[PDB]
Write a protein that binds this ligand. Sequence first.
Ligand SMILES: CC(C)CCC[C@@H](C)[C@H]1CC[C@H]2[C@@H]3CC=C4C[C@@H](OC(=O)CCC(=O)O)CC[C@]4(C)[C@H]3CC[C@]12C
Ligand SMILES: CC(C)CCC[C@@H](C)[C@H]1CC[C@H]2[C@@H]3CC=C4C[C@@H](OC(=O)CCC(=O)O)CC[C@]4(C)[C@H]3CC[C@]12C
Ligand SMILES: Cn1c(=O)n(CCCO)c(=O)c2c1nc(Oc1cccc(Cl)c1)n2Cc1ccc(Cl)cc1
Ligand SMILES: Cn1c(=O)n(CCCO)c(=O)c2c1nc(Oc1cccc(Cl)c1)n2Cc1ccc(Cl)cc1
Ligand SMILES: Cn1c(=O)n(CCCO)c(=O)c2c1nc(Oc1cccc(Cl)c1)n2Cc1ccc(Cl)cc1
Ligand SMILES: [Ca+2]
Ligand SMILES: [Ca+2]
Ligand SMILES: [Zn+2]
Ligand SMILES: [Zn+2]
Ligand SMILES: [Zn+2]
Lengths: 43, 668, 153, 668, 51
Amino acid sequence: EVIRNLVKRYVAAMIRNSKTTEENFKELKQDISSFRYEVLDLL
Amino acid sequence: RIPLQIVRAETELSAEEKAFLNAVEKGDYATVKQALQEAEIYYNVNINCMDPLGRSALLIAIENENLEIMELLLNHSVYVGDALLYAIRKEVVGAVELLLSYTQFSEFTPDITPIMLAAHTNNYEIIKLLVQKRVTIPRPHQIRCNCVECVSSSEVDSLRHSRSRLNIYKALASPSLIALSSEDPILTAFRLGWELKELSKVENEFKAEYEELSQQCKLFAKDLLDQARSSRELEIILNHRDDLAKLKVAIKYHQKEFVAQPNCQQLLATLWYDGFPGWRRKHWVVKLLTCMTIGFLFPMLSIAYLISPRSNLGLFIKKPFIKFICHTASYLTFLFMLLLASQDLHVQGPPPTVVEWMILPWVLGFIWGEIKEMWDGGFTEYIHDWWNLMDFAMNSLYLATISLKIVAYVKYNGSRPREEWEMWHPTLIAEALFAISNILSSLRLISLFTANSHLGPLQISLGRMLLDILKFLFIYCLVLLAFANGLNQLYFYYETRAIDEPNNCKGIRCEKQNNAFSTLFETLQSLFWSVFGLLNLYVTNVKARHEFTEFVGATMFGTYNVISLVVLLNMLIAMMNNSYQLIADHADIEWKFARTKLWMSYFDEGGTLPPPFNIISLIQNQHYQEVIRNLVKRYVAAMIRNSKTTEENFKELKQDISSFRYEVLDLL
Amino acid sequence: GRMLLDILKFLFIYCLVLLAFANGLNQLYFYYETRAIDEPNNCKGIRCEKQNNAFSTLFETLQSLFWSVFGLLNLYVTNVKARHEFTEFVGATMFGTYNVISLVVLLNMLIAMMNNSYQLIADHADIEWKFARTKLWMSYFDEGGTLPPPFNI
Amino acid sequence: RIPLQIVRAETELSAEEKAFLNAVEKGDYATVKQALQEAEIYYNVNINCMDPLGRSALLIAIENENLEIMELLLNHSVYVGDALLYAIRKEVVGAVELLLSYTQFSEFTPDITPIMLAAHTNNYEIIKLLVQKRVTIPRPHQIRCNCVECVSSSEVDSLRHSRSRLNIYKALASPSLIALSSEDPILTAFRLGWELKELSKVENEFKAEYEELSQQCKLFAKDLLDQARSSRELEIILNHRDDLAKLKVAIKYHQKEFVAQPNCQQLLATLWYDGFPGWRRKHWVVKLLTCMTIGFLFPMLSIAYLISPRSNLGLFIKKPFIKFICHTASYLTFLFMLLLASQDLHVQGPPPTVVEWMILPWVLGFIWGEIKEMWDGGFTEYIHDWWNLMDFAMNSLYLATISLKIVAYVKYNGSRPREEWEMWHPTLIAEALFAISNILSSLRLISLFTANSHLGPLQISLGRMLLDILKFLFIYCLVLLAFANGLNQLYFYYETRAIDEPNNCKGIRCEKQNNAFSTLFETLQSLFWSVFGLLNLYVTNVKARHEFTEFVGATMFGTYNVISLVVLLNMLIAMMNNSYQLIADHADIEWKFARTKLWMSYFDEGGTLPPPFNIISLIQNQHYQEVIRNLVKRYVAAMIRNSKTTEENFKELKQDISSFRYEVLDLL
Amino acid sequence: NYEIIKLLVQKRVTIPRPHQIRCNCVECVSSSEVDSLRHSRSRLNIYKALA
Ligand SMILES: CC(C)CCC[C@@H](C)[C@H]1CC[C@H]2[C@@H]3CC=C4C[C@@H](OC(=O)CCC(=O)O)CC[C@]4(C)[C@H]3CC[C@]12C
Ligand SMILES: CC(C)CCC[C@@H](C)[C@H]1CC[C@H]2[C@@H]3CC=C4C[C@@H](OC(=O)CCC(=O)O)CC[C@]4(C)[C@H]3CC[C@]12C
Ligand SMILES: Cn1c(=O)n(CCCO)c(=O)c2c1nc(Oc1cccc(Cl)c1)n2Cc1ccc(Cl)cc1
Ligand SMILES: Cn1c(=O)n(CCCO)c(=O)c2c1nc(Oc1cccc(Cl)c1)n2Cc1ccc(Cl)cc1
Ligand SMILES: Cn1c(=O)n(CCCO)c(=O)c2c1nc(Oc1cccc(Cl)c1)n2Cc1ccc(Cl)cc1
Ligand SMILES: [Ca+2]
Ligand SMILES: [Ca+2]
Ligand SMILES: [Zn+2]
Ligand SMILES: [Zn+2]
Ligand SMILES: [Zn+2]
């Protein structure tokens, strides 16, 4: 049970540390362009 | 093959519970609202379900900075436990206010409170929002407290108690939490940093965290001082009493960065050159000539102060730079007389000469000044100098010299040649003590390297490398004693009388060295002098034909040489290199702190005359408060600007784009 | 050349220590000064085969403390003809403390200072050298001084 | 007051020309299209107008990655000069293809061409697009070319010529441009890096740029090798002929990173331990015992190879590790015999003893092996070793020793005691030469530290610090010669005959040193030995009572001591510290290169027997091409992935958002 | 990546067991002789997965 608690805490802490690249900007551009194409088609 | 499975299993989400969480993550407001409305009727989706990462719907909404979905979840009465802590850690203004207006796994320890976490984040907006209410932080006990509660908590759970104390001190040492809710932020920062340094000393573990908290408080004080925009404000700050009272308080708490502030140093320099208004812009030759002229006239200035303090010359010595020059010139003349004191020697206990009669008043002035400083400043201040130790040694040696001179004068009258004097004759001991005192007096000039720009930081560096030297001293002494014991044990059998020696000289200080290792004292001296190569090799030889014993002694001596020179001395060089590289970054700040202490030592009325001539509130609080308010405003604005000028940012951007996309698609 | 500045800075502290211990040793030893005739070869001072009167005068004391840096001062110079063993031990202790400072403490500190300064000035060595070499080259661009000595006269 | 105005004025934009440029910057397609259509009718807006930064409308559109507005401008026939260069530098795929299909200020020099700029950017997509057409890059001339065109261009404009050459070599050294359009990328990278290193040597200026281009080519070759996925591919690569031919070519071009490749080293290690299959996983004691057993049996293996090379023992010595062990054991036995050679001495020119008779075949084998290596390998390879210099010195000294022994044997018969022999007697010179040869032979073992993991990189570091030692040698020698000249000039008047000396011994190697500075040769030796403290101080004394001369000589000697020890030796220590810190990062690669050379030296059939026993295509090209194609694909994919895994990115995001906003607003 | 690793471990997935550091079985020596590069790469990948 102690190990289960430690593993939960470690996973949460390491995910937090990782959360706190050019591919990110590419994904942002992709999202904007997909939204733009959807809006243009709908209109 | 290695089978891989889930050792610690959990409760999996249902197909709907996963679609609902995915909708929350994507920010689709319409589907989340539909799921929330359907859960009230059909009870098919648990709105409080976690995810494989442990986050619930509310935590997902908070992490994405989606205020609309967050508020929608809050209106449906979802579990909100510890959500405020996640909102505060995320440093999102919307989540707090939303949440403020309203044993599972948690990423925060049970002792964390909203105000404590906000102070940990050092976020001025959220800290101010929480301080707007009635919030409190528990008072930590004394560093060395021994009450029943402290010992009970330490014994029951040392880890929990230590963690709680560290969290409390992290909360209190927050620059934003000191900017608010603190009468005197500068004094609070000083004392809090001092207490954190003391805790770092006491707490062998967690030492780095307390050190960094103390350094953070020191930097906060320095930045508050940096926000000053006029000389009036700086004077008001430094002269505030809880002159230069607050500067003295800063010096007491070892606030080196605060003292070495460029504006603080500029004000201290304007005070330092009281007489000369344009000393900053002068040539080297002009400054040197002025210093020489002032130094050569120190007796005149001292006499003028003695006769009439209120005159163009009487009060000219009370100026700090002039007073320093006069004291330095007096000490230089004393050293010159000490040098001249060695320019009939058969008289046993001779009367003091003219040079000694001139030296005596300087020694009396030194002793009187030391005891006057002890009487005025106190005891702790006297022993904190660490330069008063050499002064005490000098004064004691001079007093012993005078006592032995008196004893030899009143116990001997005849003129017997020195060749047949006793080994412990009073005159010889007095002369040896006087020579040691002369060495110490001339070495006392090191403390004046602080006043110089080129010699000050170098003196600081050498003084701080003396600590590495001291650390190496212990291991060297252990090795030296070990090999001295071995060599003495081997060689003490062949000890020879001084008569047997070719010139009736025994020991290593003879032209032909002998009996190098016969006694432990002589063995220690021989191993000392072999470091400098002054011990000859034939000292490892004995008259008897014991070639094995001679070779074994020679091998012990060679191993001692190898260690002490090849291994220990090079290790000392490496340690000095590392320490000097470490302390080269902070040399300027330490030097400016030391020089400020030196300058302030000459600001006081007492001790104006150098030896031997020394033996012959509401409105102030209001002004300080308004200046502090201006400083806090400026500091907050500057630090917010600096922070403004992560993957979570891109996640928030994606969340905003997706929410906009879903809204547009629904509307169309 | 740029490390010569660190050497110069260390020179002041070394000279202060040297003068202090020279004053102490001279004060201790000037009573036992001996004439050159009394010496075995009529040679007085430290540049004799048997060193003598190392600390009898301040000038000789300064030279003796200088040569002890290089190990050329023998230990028996701390010995006097009279049986004043306390005086001899005190002089030997002063000499040993001077040795300890000047060699163990001061010389290693000088080495550390030189290491730091050389590491600091290694980045800009090329630019400084090119500036100096440009000055040297331009010194030979002028008509004056074309003929080297002795042809210039 | 200082008036501030525009010294170099330009032509300001009109109110419309500014609104049109602002519309282009914001990405509003509708307003830009309206302005373009209105300009054709009213001619009120110059479509080619610049901005305060010099950018035109097309440059603004390219910089914002706005393909729609760009294409709209292109359809209206705007000025397009040098726009392709900006599109290529921006590394935007859309701009090129758009522009490809179709003296003002420019940010690119006139010698820049589209393919050259694309190669500079090292962008595989654009480089491939440009190579799809028929594009060429000018061939740079020889590094030391002396044709009329090169000298004419250098004299007319040295700056332009140097810039053009550097740009061409930047284009050619592009990893992407070598991945395409190159028959053998590995060989191309090797030779291009070699030529760039040679240019860096020749070009005193621009040295850093050529160095970094060469390093980039070396890294490209190493990465191409890194993309290998099987041992078959690695063998095909290393064995390709334009065995291990390509590895030898890499070693020739000093491709240290390519040679120190872990897979290359693993293959070389499998070749190195031919006999032992499991040497990688063995204990220290087992390896040591095996090495000792093989070394003690080296004569047996040599004899077995001599008698029948085709046997379990005849060909057991041809294995590289076994051959190395046998040669090392042979050299160790030679050194052991050299040590034993010093265990009647009055015979003038005695016959060689049994130990000398055993030593002679080893010397003959050494000489024969050296001349055989010279005959087989060549001259440049022989002199590139830099270890053959010590071997040549040893062989010459041994030959001189043998010649002098023969001369003394056939010119002397009587047995005269050595005390009355001539100073230049042949036996004495022969013995001195033999002793020097013994020193050199024993010192020759340094080259075997390469084979060891712990001793190899240390030897590399010490060898590379020998260069700093050599650099310090010149300044030390200048100082030494200067002070030797001064001391000799001062002291040569008091030169005394050897008879006048107490023991008829003259010079500094006597028990009482004398005439230390009488002659220049003796003065040089005396200043040398004072470095180690072996020169006594009384050598600065003269018989005459010239106390001024003695003091001046002593002061010269003291200044020499101060310089050579305090100043020069500490500066040497500082230089060594800096150089060792610099070369500690690359120690492993250099050591692995040196060890690869050592291992490959034992791969050849020639020189198998150690002394003294030495004196008794289309399908290969196709396989290499397919392997290279796979490597290039993998390298391109990996480098694109690495690059994927700026303020201009945020500017492009803002441009996309604003263009979407304007389109939506117009539609609504 | 904890999420994807958990997703894959939700199924029945296995990772091959590396042999002894100094293993001398027929399979290890056969793989080493046939392709040393491939065998070394596979071992390193397995230990990267397990660590
Ligand atoms: C160096 C050898 C020859 C022994 C010298 C003995 C004294 C003559 C020297 C040694 C240290 C020197 C002192 C080192 C420090 C200073 C700082 C200096 O103050 C300044 O640098 C000017 C700026 C300022 O302090 O306000 C005044 C000279 C003084 C007292 C020096 C005066 C002369 C001193 C005492
Ligand atoms: C050190 C003092 C006592 C003089 C010793 C003389 C020799 C007995 C020593 C000195 C250097 C030694 C050599 C240093 C280098 C090596 C590398 C070593 O090769 C290895 O490290 C095993 C791995 C491999 O090379 O394949 C073989 C032993 C050998 C030749 C050593 C054999 C013994 C040597 C010649
Ligand atoms: C510590 N020490 C020492 O005290 N004396 C003085 C002896 C009394 O004259 C040495 O002479 C000495 C030494 N260390 C050494 O070199 C090493 C280095 C590593 C391991 C060993 Cl074992 C020795 N030597 C030189 C030497 C080498 C071989 C032989 Cl056979 C004999 C002398
Ligand atoms: C400065 N100095 C010195 O001048 N001489 C010459 C004296 C005249 O022969 C030393 O012999 C000496 C020394 N320093 C030392 O080692 C330490 C190290 C740290 C603290 C102390 Cl107190 C001593 N020694 C060795 C020694 C140790 C114990 C004893 Cl009882 C006696 C001698
Ligand atoms: C270079 N040199 C030297 O050769 N001898 C040998 C002379 C022959 O015995 C020294 O004795 C010497 C020295 N350097 C020194 O210390 C400094 C340090 C900085 C500047 C000066 Cl000027 C001197 N000394 C000690 C000394 C100081 C003052 C006096 Cl008055 C006399 C001797
Ligand atoms: Ca004091
Ligand atoms: Ca060779
Ligand atoms: Zn308590
Ligand atoms: Zn050409
Ligand atoms: Zn196996």
